[PDB]
């Protein structure tokens, strides 16, 4: 759980820094608002894999 919020936190991280770059004026709350699905698909994903590949 640790290591899979540590990835999600790093893909979420890394898509509002190339977006801050991009829109520097931009509040980053509403930035991520509007470009940051609620709830990500790193866990769901990453569990069916492990189910898929045991």
């Known amino acids: 759980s640790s290591l899979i919020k ?3 936190e790093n893909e ?5 820094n190339t977006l ?3 829109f ?3 509040d980053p709350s509403l930035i991520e608002d ?3 699905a609620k709830k990500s698909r790193i866990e769901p994903c990453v569990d ?3 189910s898929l590949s045991e």
């Not at 979420?12 to 509002?16: A, G, V």
Request: net charge neutral; hydrophobic share 45%.
């Open 6 to 8: 540590k990835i999600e």
């Open 12 to 16: 979420r991280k890394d898509t509002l």
């Open 20 to 22: 801050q770059n991009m």
């Open 24 to 26: 520097p004026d931009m």
């Open 34 to 36: 509007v470009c940051i």
């Open 48 to 50: 069916a894999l492990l």
